[PDB]
Design an enzyme around this catalytic site. Sequence first.
Site, PDB file in Angstrom:
ATOM      1  N   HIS B  43       0.786  -1.225   0.000  1.00 16.68           N
ATOM      2  CA  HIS B  43       0.000   0.000   0.000  1.00 16.68           C
ATOM      3  C   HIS B  43       0.826   1.287   0.000  1.00 16.68           C
ATOM      4  O   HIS B  43       0.269   2.368  -0.101  1.00 16.68           O
ATOM      5  CB  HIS B  43      -1.118   0.022   1.033  1.00 16.68           C
ATOM      6  CG  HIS B  43      -0.627   0.592   2.302  1.00 16.68           C
ATOM      7  ND1 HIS B  43      -0.252  -0.226   3.375  1.00 16.68           N
ATOM      8  CD2 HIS B  43      -0.428   1.880   2.651  1.00 16.68           C
ATOM      9  CE1 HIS B  43       0.154   0.578   4.337  1.00 16.68           C
ATOM     10  NE2 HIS B  43       0.043   1.854   3.937  1.00 16.68           N
ATOM     11  N   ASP B  99      -0.340  -7.298   2.125  1.00 16.66           N
ATOM     12  CA  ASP B  99       0.210  -5.995   1.915  1.00 16.66           C
ATOM     13  C   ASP B  99       1.747  -6.073   2.060  1.00 16.66           C
ATOM     14  O   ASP B  99       2.357  -5.622   3.042  1.00 16.66           O
ATOM     15  CB  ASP B  99      -0.371  -5.057   2.964  1.00 16.66           C
ATOM     16  CG  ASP B  99       0.035  -3.653   2.720  1.00 16.66           C
ATOM     17  OD1 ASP B  99       0.481  -3.286   1.629  1.00 16.66           O
ATOM     18  OD2 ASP B  99      -0.147  -2.876   3.784  1.00 16.66           O
ATOM     19  N   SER B 205       3.953   3.285   8.117  1.00 15.32           N
ATOM     20  CA  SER B 205       3.639   2.150   7.238  1.00 15.32           C
ATOM     21  C   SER B 205       4.854   1.657   6.506  1.00 15.32           C
ATOM     22  O   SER B 205       5.687   2.454   6.109  1.00 15.32           O
ATOM     23  CB  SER B 205       2.637   2.544   6.164  1.00 15.32           C
ATOM     24  OG  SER B 205       1.488   3.149   6.723  1.00 15.32           O
TER      25      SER B 205
END
Lengths: 29, 257, 10
Positions: B43, B99, B205
Amino acid sequence: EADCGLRPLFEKKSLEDKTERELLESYID
Amino acid sequence: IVEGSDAEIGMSPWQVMLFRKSPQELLCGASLISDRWVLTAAHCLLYPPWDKNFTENDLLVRIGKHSRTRYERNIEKISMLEKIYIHPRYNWRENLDRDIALMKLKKPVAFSDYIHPVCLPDRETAASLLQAGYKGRVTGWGNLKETWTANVGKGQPSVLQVVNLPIVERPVCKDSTRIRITDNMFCAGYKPDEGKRGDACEGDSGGPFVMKSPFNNRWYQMGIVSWGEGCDRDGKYGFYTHVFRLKKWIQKVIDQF
Amino acid sequence: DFEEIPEEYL
């Protein structure tokens, strides 16, 4: 084979970081 | 990172920063699993929902950093991407399942006191470290708060932040989101009655969720900062990509032989 | 913010 996981300024110098023990103790509870 | 602390220098030598060329900005965290490979969250590179679709030329990889904004001339290393690999079954439409993504550096990087790879888990290791109640450690340069008063401060930290969170029981994770979690994820964080806080946040992230093996003294990357509902909310937890299960794919992509 | 990196990279 290739080394990894051993921090050059820590593990390798026989020193530990400030909150490393919280990780370790979490096992032996 | 919410409710974290400044990391000590050289605390996470495997921590990589994903830098955007223009505009210059911090995209995400990532880890160094070797001399030429970087592991990040998918992502971070691709999320159509927001018209997000980076290519090898739009980014830079900065390894060996402490300070968020400085250009650490003598310590950090700035690498260019040779190729990006996203998990073929990355589900950005419903839950961000799988992911995960690898990036191949153009030229190998030279290890140092500040730059060193993290280890990937093996069956037994995963097996015994990945247990609810056991603590992990997250690191990053992301938001210090889920939200904050504009212009009155700075949502971002000056130096790399660090936080230790415990693993939560699947059932507990499941009951915390209306989202469909998969066996490719795992959750971490303190519980409301736990008296402690902490969480990853926007900017963190792709970052690594690592654990330390008491028997061999090495650090292992069990997960990748994936998603979450806000930051540091009670009765909510952070979701991480399960590095151990997606391992075969990594294996298949890397081809060391 | 960021201090500027060498432009060869930019």
